[PDB]
Design a protein around this ligand. Structure first.
Ligand code: 303
Length: 245
């Protein structure tokens, strides 16, 4: 996150920290995720497309720092890694960038809800918050575009949803942004998600209930003028999630 505020997992019960083991033994952070149901996590396909082995991943819940085992956390493994069957990556835009990771602990059980481990509701058919709505994003991603290390503590920030016609203007993303994607950004371009945040939650309070409306996907740079952050429009993929879970 660029700018924003430092927060602790208690505020983001449904945020999943996804890691990956390397030959030799080191473990680096990869991407974020959202707790769908006790046994499922949803993220982005571009965080696993290159190393499609369910065995190389680790998924943490209730973890507040990168190199610390926060009180009440749970360590998991990927029982099933399902990727959208039509994914492609262009110069900027990423298509069908949605993914399902069916988690499972060494003992064979799924997540166990608590004060620090919760789930968010999926959006419903054709019901997306209007443009200009404020929503939050979370991740252990960069705090600057020139840093190579991630913040040791979880961060969060708020942005505003941008209409589709406004995201297709020449000085924005032209025809690169498609109707199955959403755009969000700070009207002052000082705060925004960035590299390391991909796959993470974009939560909008829709008609009372906190809804998972977007999945961090792509964007030109981080917090750059007229260059919003593009997210995966969950509502569109409901039939996919349902039939695939
Ligand atoms: C190491 C890297 C090149 C990695 N390789 C596997 C394929 C692949 C695909 C996309 C990405 N994505 C990013 O690095 C990446 C970089 C910047 C991003 C910026 C925003 C945003 N400005 N809100 C929103 C999302 C962003 C995602 C990384 C990789």
């Amino acid at each position: 996150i660029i700018g924003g505020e430092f927060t602790t997992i208690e505020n983001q019960p449904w945020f999943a920290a996804i890691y990956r083991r390397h030959r030799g033994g080191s473990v680096t952070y990869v991407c974020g995720g959202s707790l769908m149901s006790p046994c499922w996590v949803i993220s982005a396909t571009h965080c696993f497309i290159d190393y499609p082995k369910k065995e190389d991943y680790i998924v943490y819940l209730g973890r507040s720092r990168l190199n610390s085992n926060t009180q009440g956390e749970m360590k998991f493994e990927v029982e099933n890694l399902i990727l959208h069957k039509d994914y492609s990556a262009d110069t900027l835009a990423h298509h069908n960038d949605i993914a399902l990771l069916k988690i499972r602990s060494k003992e064979g059980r799924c997540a166990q809800p608590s004060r620090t481990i919760q789930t968010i509701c999926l959006p419903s058919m054709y019901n997306d918050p209007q443009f200009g709505t404020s929503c939050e994003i979370t991740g252990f991603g960069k705090e600057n575009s020139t840093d190579y290390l991630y913040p040791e503590q979880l961060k969060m920030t708020v942005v505003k949803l941008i209409s589709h016609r406004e995201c297709q203007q020449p000085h924005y993303y032209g025809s690169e942004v498609t109707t199955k994607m959403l755009c969000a950004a700070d009207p002052q371009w000082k705060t925004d998600s960035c590299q390391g945040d991909s796959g993470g939650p974009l939560v909008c309070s829709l008609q009372g209930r906190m809804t998972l409306t977007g999945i961090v996907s792509w964007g030109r740079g981080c917090a750059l003028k007229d260059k919003p952050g593009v997210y995966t429009r969950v509502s569109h993929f409901l039939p996919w999630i349902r039939s695939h879970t």
